[PDB]
């Protein structure tokens, strides 16, 4: 009955008896973790036991239930430290992630690696498997070294071992190997740690940020489909005006990624078929457990998931991504529209945006936006009632306060968009 944080020193927040909505909780969480108002949209709530995400509009009526506050919408090579991968950036009037969000992503990466939510890739061969295990030890060294740098302690100061900083499956794999192999691994680890902390760390003056980035990039390369969600289905439909391809008799996978959009494939006993990138979707309809995604070319993808909740999770992912790369003020399905965005466009309120865009929007025309620093006020301060900074009259809603007191352009560019 609480929202959990992967950060080291962040107590969870217990929920009392009452009605809640996922978005408000995500705001509280974003506030708790010093997350900027721009990056708040990247985060969502994950239901640990059912393995199902919550859409922003999902109502929680309160039993034991533990929800993880985590970054859901991810873009490979956001760090731009990859030459074989396309760069990711944000429109200027520049990087995707700030430090605050990056820290949380790092914590998240550690938790995922250890608890195997981010499982290691399968070995193409025995040596490759060994090499994967080696890289795991490397990751352990990275984690421990980061912890060392943060606490301003050195190697003689720290007591610990590699065992709680690797995937549990590998650890348990190791504990069943003979003594000599366990000894060997532990020694080799200790050597890696020693060398890294004696020479490399200061020879190149490796910062903490650098280690985080390294860790996460290694996560991208070392684990299965990192920063991606895969959905199973036994009934898949890909159709157009003159085509109607139905796949049936869970045998089919549909993957959603932030830099390739929606893809699908026959679940293996090779490569993914691209359906659509996000900007091409016009709308998404849900009927029961069935999701129907409509593209601009009148093409359609339709799939039947396990239930309604999973459909909500799926579309909420797709929708969030659409907001991330297409239009920051439009939504694709009413079933998962965040009340804020609805009330936003309903009252003609933009999103927090860089000023140049505001002044430009004002010049080529009163523009209403959101505070680029905090969630508490609209650039007018809203509370649990709407009013101005110096005002005393609590107008029950924005519309009322505005009545007694321009608009956002569809598919308009901004720093709220990721160029991929």
């Amino acid at each position: 009955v609480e929202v959990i944080f992967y950060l080291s020193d962040r107590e969870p927040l217990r929920l009392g008896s009452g009605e809640y909505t996922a978005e408000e909780l995500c705001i509280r969480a974003a506030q708790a973790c010093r997350i900027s108002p721009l990056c708040h949209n990247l985060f969502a709530l994950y239901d640990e036991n059912t393995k199902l995400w919550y859409a922003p509009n999902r109502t929680i009526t309160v039993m034991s239930l533990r929800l993880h506050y985590r970054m859901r919408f991810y873009f490979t090579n956001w760090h731009g430290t990859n030459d074989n991968e396309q760069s990711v950036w944000r429109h200027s009037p520049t990087p995707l992630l700030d430090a605050s969000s990056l820290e949380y992503l790092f914590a998240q990466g550690q938790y995922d690696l250890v608890k195997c939510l981010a499982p290691i890739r399968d070995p193409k061969t025995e040596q490759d498997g060994h090499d994967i295990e080696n890289e795991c030890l490397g990751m352990a060294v990275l984690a421990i070294s980061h912890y060392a740098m943060m606490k301003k302690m050195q190697l003689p100061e720290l007591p610990i071992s590699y065992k709680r900083y690797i995937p549990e499956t590998l650890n348990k794999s190791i504990r069943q190997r003979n003594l000599l192999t366990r000894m060997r691994i532990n020694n080799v680890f200790k050597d890696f740690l020693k060398e890294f902390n004696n020479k490399t760390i200061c020879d190149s003056s490796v910062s903490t940020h650098d280690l985080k980035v390294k860790y996460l990039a290694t996560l991208e390369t070392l684990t299965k489909h990192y920063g991606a969600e895969i959905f199973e289905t036994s009934m898949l439909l890909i159709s157009s005006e003159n085509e109607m391809n139905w796949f049936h008799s869970l045998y089919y996978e549909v993957m959603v990624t932030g830099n390739l959009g929606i893809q699908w494939r026959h679940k293996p006993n090779e490569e993914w078929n691209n359906f659509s990138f996000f900007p091409e979707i016009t709308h998404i309809v849900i009927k029961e457990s069935v999701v129907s995604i409509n593209k601009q070319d009148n093409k359609k993808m339709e799939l039947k998931l396990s239930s309604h909740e999973e459909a909500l999770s799926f579309v909420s992912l797709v929708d969030g991504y659409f907001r991330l790369t297409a239009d920051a003020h439009h939504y694709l399905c009413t079933d998962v529209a965040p009340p804020l965005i609805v009330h936003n466009i309903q009252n003609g309120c933009h999103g927090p945006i860089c000023t140049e865009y505001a002044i430009n929007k004002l010049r080529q025309e009163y523009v209403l936006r959101w505070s680029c620093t905090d969630f508490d006020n609209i650039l007018i301060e809203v509370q649990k009632r709407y009013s101005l900074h110096g005002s005393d009259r609590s107008f029950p809603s924005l519309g009322d306060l505005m009545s007694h007191l321009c608009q956002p352009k569809p598919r308009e560019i901004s720093n709220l968009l990721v160029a991929t």
Binding site: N134, E135, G138, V141, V188, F192, T200
Partner: peptide, 21 residues
């Protein structure tokens, strides 16, 4: 079976995860 006969008793190589500029 042998105690030492497995990939871990190859010559230890620094993992690429710890490579820096």
């Amino acid at each position: 079976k042998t105690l030492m006969g497995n990939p871990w008793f190859q010559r230890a190589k620094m993992p690429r995860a710890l490579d820096f500029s």
